[PDB]
Design a protein around this ligand. Structure first.
Ligand SMILES: Cc1cc2nc3c(=O)[nH]c(=O)nc-3n(C[C@H](O)[C@H](O)[C@H](O)COP(=O)(O)O)c2cc1C
Ligand SMILES: Cc1cc2nc3c(=O)[nH]c(=O)nc-3n(C[C@H](O)[C@H](O)[C@H](O)COP(=O)(O)O)c2cc1C
Ligand SMILES: [Ca+2]
Ligand SMILES: [Ca+2]
Lengths: 530, 533
């Protein structure tokens, strides 16, 4: 035995309730003893075998005082000014709302404002509110890649730069773009001491090794010289942009709610971590690149598994939409509280509909995925809305669109023409495009209906969620978290973090050969954390 | 206050990263970490208590400590004991002998459990496999795959009787949707009492499942009714029937997450806690003297994933994908070379030949073969149209020239001959159903693509159906730039030991990092910088 202590019999508890309370106490170490008869016992005080003296037992196992700060990368917590190696990911169209961002940031927890799909004045509005509530952070804003429209992306970056938004979650990118590189380089300088200052921080969320590679390596000299080209960056921005990675943190996004490649967390995260060590050994950054991970994290066990694999931080998404601070309707959050792991499925995505791309959504309690998948089948099979069989089309019009396809198209032409005339000119004299735009009316609005609580459209709510939500609901069954109105994002974050810490301590004891009562092997939500 | 009551003498500290790596890799000894004000993080393997043997010297206090713990600290020691193996690990079955006799024998010779891939093999071929494996491993360890035959109960029964005749004492039961009389017969026929100690379970069963119901059925004892039926056959005895109700139908349950081959794509991190919670329920109910165990595979291709799986509570880990790429596997040189460069995103889902019409899928390689594209096109056409005659002429002629290399009518004629000889009901059922006819025609391609890849059919390489999941891509990225880049140097025992010793190494490094030590970054992960076997 490596443990040089003895435990007095009066300091041991063989009571499983007392033992759980000792294991839950991260401020003190635990000493485990084996009584041939009363079984496993735990104490919090021990003496050296020579310092104090029979009726003493030798320490069979030990685990020291360690809490949530022992999980993940301390440099993440330092760089982002957060109390936990954790962030709540963006949720589109304000689902990761100002209320959610402010509630989490006030508790010291990073959260990403869901700017995707929101108009610029709405986003500036969120910037002002969040910065007024959190003058020193923490928070970040989602920059979603706009492949069709680089100007929108550039405007979002310029809004962030104007207001000194210092942290961006960059997602849906397939590589670098001038806009994100601009945001990155505009924040680079040096102090009077040679230390280089990275003021604009970037968390790049990726699921593909090549995209991760682009964000782990510095911005390419060519793109930076074309930014020195205009009125965008400085000769102090380029020299330094080539000595720092394009991102401080890489989020490996496994199988998730919403847009996803449905990649296993146990295969995606090791791949990105191996790439991280390759690139970090090559470039020898003074502050190393970090890799965190989300997608499937709904329970303390999944969180601990993610940390144990090497993640610098964990990311949650699906469980946060179910909390009262999220910008989801009352009906939607109620529905989410009973969604099981098999109650999600893949359905066509509005913004990549014609390319066959899908996203993960709730399928129980809503007909959205069935109707959206039917739209994709009709789109691919037929050359035009006029080629759709009459029965199918009148089913569409009366139950899905609640209007004729012609009237949907008329509204689409009016809307686009008076906003983005390129979209309607482009579909002019092309029935495939026309049909795709008509169907995207439904694909686009179903999300909004769920977010706003549009009455009478419940059967059509598009609700992004992955199996992490069902995992959460199963783990929380029989607790106060069964009530959707009792779900708070800060409380959820703390359950995941403190539960992972508890499981980590228990695993250390099990690893040392101790057989704990089954009442100590897991963290049940029998008490509120916040 | 620091919990470590030792100090470390200066001559026992190393700040050399190579030596520190050797120390962390040495699981027979503990590691004491110190912070030297000037030289930084250092490691020693011996420390002394502040009194005992030290005096005021150049000694430093222990900033962190981790004890001597290796691979035996991973998983369930009862798994290792019951199956007679050195590691809580097994290489899962790979159909049509891909998990070959040589693979089983290499792994079992190293003390590692492997499952012979009997699926799709005729009885004389399986008997030849039994002969070889038992000649090389007269006392084990090994097991054989019993795949559920829903269509054919007689074949499952024949495989069970072959296993019983030859005293095959361990079966991996897979693709089951519940109990069958055959698996129950295998389990109960191995039951007795030593009449002086306690009940003896000689025929061991590892049930690989993805659903809770089936898992529950194998965690619970065989149902009395099922045991009572055939008690009239003389297959088992009344003392075997009565003992069968005191033991679970399986000693081990493999929770199969998203995997190569047949899969429903369940996340490991959500499936495994579910099956473990069910296990603890059932074990609290029945209080078996030897507890039921739950292990896990599907996505385990790297040591970090192995460790995470163990730390969620898995009794053992299961690998598949990475084993097909090794030299002992019964895969062709073309396939093993292709697999050594298959990346994480080079796999995809394609229709399964069995339950094709039900939309059921399996995970396959898409780089180096057009099979998944062509098979998914077959499923799309099948679901869209009511008959082969409804397919547009240009699409049908493309199919016939590029996929079947034959008209669909000629495929149908050969199909009629084939099933007349082997299962005529399948043609009879198609008589008044053109949809069924089309499904049978498309299943020609779904079946033969597998046969072509397994046998190495020349000229059909672009149609090879090759089962693999992203665990292979994870392995390949983790092994990039190492000796494992060469497919000719990939050995299954070596892979297993990298997973097991890497998981133990990472567990130790995680403990030290959690305690606040900042180790040199080269030491934070287990990289294949060394051959293990
Ligand atoms: C309803 C919902 C909306 C989301 N919207 C966005 C988004 O707009 N931009 C983005 O980068 N990620 C978005 N995500 C992804 C999350 O930020 C997070 O990465 C992911 O949900 C974590 O996986 P999980 O769902 O299994 O928890 C969204 C997720 C959900 C559930
Ligand atoms: C090519 C291949 C063939 C397989 N054949 C079988 C089989 O015949 N029977 C079975 O039970 N499992 C079979 N499996 C599943 C493996 O035994 C194992 O459960 C699975 O591969 C583990 O998941 P992984 O691929 O992510 O490692 C096969 C897997 C592969 C890759
Ligand atoms: Ca997403
Ligand atoms: Ca399988």
């Amino acid at each position: 035995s490596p443990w040089p202590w003895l435990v007095t019999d009066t300091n041991i508890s063989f009571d499983v309730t007392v033992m759980e309370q000792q294991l839950r106490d991260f401020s003190r170490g635990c000493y485990v003893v084996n009584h041939n008869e009363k079984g496993v016992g735990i104490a919090q005080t021990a003496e050296l075998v020579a310092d104090q003296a029979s009726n003493s037992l030798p320490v069979a196992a030990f685990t020291p005082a360690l809490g949530t700060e022992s999980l993940g990368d301390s440099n993440f917590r330092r760089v982002h000014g957060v109390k936990y190696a954790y962030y709540a990911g963006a949720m589109a169209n304000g689902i990761s709302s100002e209320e959610l961002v402010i509630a989490l940031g006030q508790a010291g927890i990073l959260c990403s404002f869901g700017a995707a799909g929101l108009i610029p004045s709405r986003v500036e509005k969120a910037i002002n509110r969040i910065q007024a509530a959190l003058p020193n952070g923490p928070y970040m804003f989602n920059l979603i890649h706009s492949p069709s429209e680089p100007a929108l992306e550039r405007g979002s970056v310029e809004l962030f730069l104007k207001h000194k938004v210092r942290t961006v979650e960059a997602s849906a990118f397939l590589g670098l773009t001038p806009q994100i590189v601009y945001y990155r380089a505009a924040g680079l300088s040096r102090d009077a001491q040679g230390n280089i200052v990275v003021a604009n921080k970037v968390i790049a969320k990726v699921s593909r090794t090549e995209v991760a590679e682009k964000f782990m390596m510095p911005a390419p000299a060519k793109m930076l010289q074309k930014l020195v080209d205009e009125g965008s960056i400085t000769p102090e921005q380029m020299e330094l942009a080539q000595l720092v990675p394009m991102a401080d943190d890489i989020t490996a996004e496994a199988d998730s709610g919403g847009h996803t490649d449905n990649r296993p967390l146990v295969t995606l995260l090791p791949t990105i971590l191996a790439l991280k060590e390759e690139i970090q050994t090559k470039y020898q950054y003074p502050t190393p690149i970090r890799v965190g991970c989300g997608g499937g994290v709904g329970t303390p066990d999944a969180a601990l598994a993610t940390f144990n694999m090497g993640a610098a931080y964990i990311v949650t998404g699906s469980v946060n939409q179910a909390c009262v601070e999220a910008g989801a309707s009352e009906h939607t959050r109620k529905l989410l509280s009973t969604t099981e792991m098999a109650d999600v499925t893949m359905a066509p995505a509005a913004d990549m509909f014609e390319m066959g791309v899908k996203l993960q959504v709730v399928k129980r309690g809503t007909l959205f995925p069935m109707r959206a998948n039917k739209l994709y089948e009709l789109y691919t099979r037929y050359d035009s809305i006029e080629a759709i069989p009459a029965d199918e089309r009148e089913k569409l019009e009366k139950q899905v669109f609640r209007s004729t396809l012609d009237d949907i198209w008329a509204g689409t032409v009016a809307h686009f023409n008076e906003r983005d005339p390129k979209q309607i000119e482009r579909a002019t004299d092309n029935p495939k495009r026309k049909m795709a735009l008509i169907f995207r009316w439904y694909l686009g609005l179903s999300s909004r209906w769920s977010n706003s609580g549009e009455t009478g459209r419940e059967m059509d709510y598009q609700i992004w969620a992955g199996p992490a939500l069902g995992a959460f609901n199963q783990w929380a069954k029989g607790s106060y978290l069964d009530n959707y109105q009792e779900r708070n994002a800060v409380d959820v974050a703390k359950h995941l973090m403190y539960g992972a810490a508890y499981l980590n301590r228990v695993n250390s004891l099990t690893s040392q050969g101790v057989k704990l009562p089954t009442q100590l092997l897991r963290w049940k939500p029998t008490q509120r954390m916040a």
